Structure formats: structure tokens, C-alpha cells
Amino acid sequence: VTPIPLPKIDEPEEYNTNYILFWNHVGLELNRVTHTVGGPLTGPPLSARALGMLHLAIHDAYFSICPPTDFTTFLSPDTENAAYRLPSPNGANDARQAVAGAALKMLSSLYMKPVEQPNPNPGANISDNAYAQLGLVLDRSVLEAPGGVDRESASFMFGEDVADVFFALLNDPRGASQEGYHPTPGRYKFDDEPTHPVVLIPVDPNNPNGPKMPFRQYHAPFYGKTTKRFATQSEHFLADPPGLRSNADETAEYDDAVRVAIAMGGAQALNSTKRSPWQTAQGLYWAYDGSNLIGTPPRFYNQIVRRIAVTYKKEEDLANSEVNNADFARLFALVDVACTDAGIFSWKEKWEFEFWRPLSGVRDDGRPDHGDPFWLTLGAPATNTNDIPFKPPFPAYPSGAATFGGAVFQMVRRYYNGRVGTWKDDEPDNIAIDMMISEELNGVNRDLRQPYDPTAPIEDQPGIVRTRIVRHFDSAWELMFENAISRIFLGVHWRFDAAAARDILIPTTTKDVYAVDNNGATVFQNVEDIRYTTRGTREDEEGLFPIGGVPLGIEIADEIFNNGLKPTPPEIQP
Numbered sequence: 147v148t149p150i151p152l153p154k155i156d157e158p159e160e161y162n163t164n165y166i167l168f169w170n171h172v173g174l175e176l177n178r179v180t181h182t183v184g185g186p187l188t189g190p191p192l193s194a195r196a197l198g199m200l201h202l203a204i205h206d207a208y209f210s211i212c213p214p215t216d217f218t219t220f221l222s223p224d225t226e227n228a229a230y231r232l233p234s235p236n237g238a239n240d241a242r243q244a245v246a247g248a249a250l251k252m253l254s255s256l257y258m259k260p261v262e263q264p265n266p267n268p269g270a271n272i273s274d275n276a277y278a279q280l281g282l283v284l285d286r287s288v289l290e291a292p293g294g295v296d297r298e299s300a301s302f303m304f305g306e307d308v309a310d311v312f313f314a315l316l317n318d319p320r321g322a323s324q325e326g327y328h329p330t331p332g333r334y335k336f337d338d339e340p341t342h343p344v345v346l347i348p349v350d351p352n353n354p355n356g357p358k359m360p361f362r363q364y365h366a367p368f369y370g371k372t373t374k375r376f377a378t379q380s381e382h383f384l385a386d387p388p389g390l391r392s393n394a395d396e397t398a399e400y401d402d403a404v405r406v407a408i409a410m411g412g413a414q415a416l417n418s419t420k421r422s423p424w425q426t427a428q429g430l431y432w433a434y435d436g437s438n439l440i441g442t443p444p445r446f447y448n449q450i451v452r453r454i455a456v457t458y459k460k461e462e463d464l465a466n467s468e469v470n471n472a473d474f475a476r477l478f479a480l481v482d483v484a485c486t487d488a489g490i491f492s493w494k495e496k497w498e499f500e501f502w503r504p505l506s507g508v509r510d511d512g513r514p515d516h517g518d519p520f521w522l523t524l525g526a527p528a529t530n531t532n533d534i535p536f537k538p539p540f541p542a543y544p545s546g547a548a549t550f551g552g553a554v555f556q557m558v559r560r561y562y563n564g565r566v567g568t569w570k571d572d573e574p575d576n577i578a579i580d581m582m583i584s585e586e587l588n589g590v591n592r593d594l595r596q597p598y599d600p601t602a603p604i605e606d607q608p609g610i611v612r613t614r615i616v617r618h619f620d621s622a623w624e625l626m627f628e629n630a631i632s633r634i635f636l637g638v639h640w641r642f643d644a645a646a647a648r649d650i651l652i653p654t655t656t657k658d659v660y661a662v663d664n665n666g667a668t669v670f671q672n673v674e675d676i677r678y679t680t681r682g683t684r685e686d687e688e689g690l691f692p693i694g695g696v697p698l699g700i701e702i703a704d705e706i707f708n709n710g711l712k713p714t715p716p717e718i719q720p
């Protein structure tokens with residue numbers, strides 16, 4: 147197969163001289179490649195899970211050889227339960243090779259062709275080319291690994307054993323299974339996307355030009371309720387969204403949300419769209435919608451975290467500093483585990499409520515003075531492709547990206563508190579970064595005139611180039627905020643999918659109705675003023691629960707960090 151020419155990453159080449167960062171990078175490369183060829187572990191929740199598994203293996207492999215002081219390994223060597231028992235180094239003392247072994251074994255197990263039975267049903271959809279393309283990435287990473295790879299070393303072999311334990315423990319082969327699920331139409335109810343109601347997929351993936359068959363995808367409807375959690379110590383729930391169950395009476399919030407959805411997330415040339423050019427940029431910047439050569443949101447969050455890590459590293463030598471290695475190893479384990487669990491819980495709630503997307507809500511509203519039967523959103527950008535392909539659909543509430551961001555950035559905050567500065571766990575931090583470029587707006591990627599050619603580099607393919615925008619952020623609190631609201635600008639999520647409207651919008655004298663500027667564009671509170679404290683009720687449970695994905699993510703990250711990254715007790719696993 148012809149190797150896919152991957153575009154250059156906007157990041158200092160010095161980063162990959164550190165082996166921890168190098169392996170994180172390989173995981174990121176596999177993420178973007180798998181979404182380009184349609185391989186395994188695609189979609190938001192599962193792509194996050196792969197990174198969580200990769201980093202847990204690296205974490206325990208490294209720390210087994212170089213024991214930490216203020217914490218321990220995820221699994222222990224003395225665990226009576228064999229499934230949770232970590233292997234012994236027994237002489238192995240080369241952390242570099244141990245990490246290499248863990249990373250390579252995990253990634254290979256995750257992306258290899260499931261010949262061992264799983265080929266049927268599960269893998270029966272992924273082409274052999276998809277597997278070959280992924281194999282290529284793994285093959286060249288071995289050649290690029292700083293310090294080389296020695297598969298004959300006891301240390302490498304030890305890393306491999308660590309990976310085997312984690313893979314056997316946390317891999318969910320049936321992850322995105324939709325077998326048996328069917329939408330339950332009605333008001334507020336999720337259903338097939340009116341702009342992409344069906345997909346024509348080949349009967350034989352290895353014969354893409356042969357007969358096709360209509361298919362209706364539903365992205366992982368059972369994953370959230372049945373999959374094994376990583377480090378969360380309890381179940382997390384959200385308040386009922388406006389219009390459903392206990393909050394069925396919040397019609398003022400719902401109606402105003404529809405109003406805002408139309409003005410802020412409609413297609414650019416619609417007379418009803420009030421979103422500014424700058425807000426459109428903010429919307430695209432955080433997208434990462436499983437596009438060709440781009441991948442999913444977890445990949446971008448990792449790109450951002452890489453810069454933060456290097457920017458605030460304790461020692462200057464990226465290559466030979468054990469302090470830096472331990473630092474990066476611990477940080478990424480925490481960040482990616484939180485990302486994995488955020489994906490589990492956002493998906494659980496998504497499919498629990500089955501709340502419809504703004505597109506369907508506005509079109510099927512039914513009230514002449516509220517809806518727009520012909521409304522169109524700016525939508526999630528279909529980057530490096532000539533059309534808007536069918537992307538696996540899933541409910542709106544809560545926003546997956548909002549949740550991912552909440553967990554990832556709150557984790558970064560908890561981890562760097564006292565070091566970069568000092569702040570309350572629920573107040574803005576000072577973790578600033580600059581020269582942060584999104585692959586959605588990097589002056590290289592584009593919207594093609596013809597179908598993507600996997601044999602040619604992106605710059606040689608005709609299309610409209612995405613403007614290059616270099617950003618600077620004042621804090622992780624800001625990153626978290628913008629990442630969440632960008633979804634409103636895209637028109638893919640309701641305001642409450644991100645967080646409680648009262649916590650992010652400017653209120654008026656009318657309850658549940660928020661302010662807009664001269665142009666009719668919604669006004670947001672200053673990032674420094676934002677506090678996610680507004681809560682709501684649940685019909686099935688007593689108490690007050692958070693509203694939206696950001697609060698959920700923060701809640702998840704705080705719990706994992708407070709417990710010091712400990713395995714979810716098996717007694718509470720599904």
C-alpha cells in the first residue's frame with residue numbers, strides 16, 4: 147500500500163527528543179491516520195480510551211523501574227487479583243526501553259488486525275489497507291525512537307508484559323456496538339440527522355468499488371453504561387436538560403436556547419446568522435471532528451498539553467532529564483485517564499437522555515414563530531475532503547468536547563497548582579501559552595475541490611486553504627471555556643450542552659433570556675468571572691446535579707486527582 151503522506155505538525159522538533167513525548171506523538175499519529183483510513187478506535191470516546199491505555203502502560207512501566215515518591219503505580223505487583231497484578235522488573239533497569247516496550251505492545255495490540263476471532267463482526271468492516279497504513283506508522287516510529295528500540299532487552303520485554311496486563315484489563319472490543327438500538331422519535335428526541343440520514347457503505351470493505359448497502363450508524367449507544375471505567379470512584383450524573391423530565395417546565399430556557407442556536411450557529415450566508423467572523427474562527431479552531439489527517443478532539447487536547455508540559459518543565463534538557471520524564475509520564479497518565487473517563491460519562495448521559503441536536507430541534511420545532519424548517523448550521527468542518535461526509539451520529543446533551551475539555555484542563559490545573567502559580571480549584575489559573583496553532587486553521591489544511599487523494603500530500607491537492615491563526619491563551623480556564631462555546635458557534639450543541647446558561651451568558655431582566663449586542667449576537671461573561679456553580683434536578687434521583695459537559699468534566703478530573711489516580715474498584719464496575 148502507498149504510505150499516506152502526513153503533513154507536518156506545528157510544534158518545535160525538540161519535543162520528540164524526549165521519549166515520553168515521542169510515544170505520545172506516535173499515539174497521536176495513529177489517531178489521525180485511523181480516522182483517515184477508517185481503521186479501529188475511531189470516534190470521540192474510543193479514541194480517548196486508546197490514549198488512556200497507552201499512557202497507563204507507559205506510566206506503570208516507567209515508574210516500576212524508577213519508583214515515585216509522592217504517589218505509586220496504577221496497579222501493584224502484590225495485587226492478589228491477577229487481573230490487576232503488575233509484573234515485576236526483576237533486574238530490568240532501562241526505563242527508556244521499558245517505556246518503548248509498553249508503548250509498542252499496547253499500540254500494536256490496539257491497532258493490529260484482530261485475526262484472533264475478533265476479525266468476524268467486530269473487525270468485519272475495516273479494510274486490510276486500513277490495517278496496513280497503521281502498521282506503517284508503527285514501523286517507522288521504531289526507526290525514529292530517540293535512543294533506538296532494543297526488542298531483545300529485558301527492559302523492553304518487561305514493558306511488553308506491563309502492556310499485556312493493561313490491554314487485557316481495559317480493552318473493550320465491542321465498544322461502538324449499536325446492535326439492537328433504534329431511535330425513539332418524538333419531541334426532544336434524537337434521531338437520524340436530516341442532512342445525513344443514511345450512508346452507502348460497501349458490502350465488502352476490501353472491495354470499496356463494488357456493491358454498497360444503505361446503513362444507519364449510531365455511535366456507541368451502549369458503551370457508557372457497560373464499559374469498564376478507568377479511575378473514577380463513583381458514577382456521575384447531570385441535571386435533566388430543559389424540556390425533559392423534571393425540567394420539562396423550563397420552556398423559557400428552551401425557547402431562548404433555540405433563539406441563540408439560530409443566531410450563533412447558522413450557516414454563514416443565512417440572513418438569520420449573527421455570528422461574527424472572529425466567532426466563526428473560534429468555532430473551527432476547536433473542531434477536530436474526525437477529519438482526514440486531523441483526527442478527533444482528544445488529539446488536539448494532547449497537542450495543547452504537550453506545549454504546556456514543555457513550557458512549564460522543571461529542567462531544560464528534554465532529552466536526558468529524568469525529572470522531565472517522570473513529570474511528563476505522570477501528567478499524561480492523569481490527563482488521558484481523565485479524558486477516557488470523561489468520554490465514558492458524557493456518552494452514558496448522552497444516550498440516557500437522547501436529547502436532539504439543534505439542527506433537528508429548530509427544523510422540527512413546529513411553532514411557525516420559533517422554528518425554521520429549512521435551517522442549516524455552520525456545522526462541524528469536513529476538513530481535507532470535498533464534501534460533508536456522513537459522520538456517526540449521537541445525542542446532544544451533554545457536549546462530548548465540553549466534557550473532554552473540562553476533565554483535561556481541570557486536571558492540568560490541579561497538577562500545576564502551586565507550581566505555575568496558586569489558585570483556588572474552582573477559580574481561574576495563570577497557565578498561559580502562546581503560538582498555539584490548530585490544524586483546522588493552520589494555512590495548510592483545506593476544503594478540497596475533489597475527493598481526498600491518500601497518495602498525495604495535502605498541499606498538492608486543489609482546495610480552499612484554511613487561514614493560519616496563531617493563538618495565545620491566558621489560562622487553562624480560558625481554553626476550557628472557549629473549547630466548550632465553540633460548539634455553539636458551530637451550531638452542533640445547545641448552550642446547556644456546554645454548561646448552565648446562567649454561568650456563561652449575560653443575563654437580562656427577563657429570567658432565562660440572555661443579552662445580545664447591537665448585531666443580535668449573544669454576549670458571554672468574562673472568562674475570569676465564570677464559575678460553574680448553577681445546578682439542576684433529576685427526575686430519577688434526589689439532589690442537585692451539574693448542568694452541561696464542562697461541570698461534568700471538572701467533577702470527574704477532581705475525583706481522579708483526589709484519589710491519586712487509583713483503579714475504579716471492580717465492585718462498582720458495570
Ligand code: VO4
Nearest residue numbers: 545546547548638
Ligand atoms: O462532540 V459534541 O458531542 O461536543 O458535538
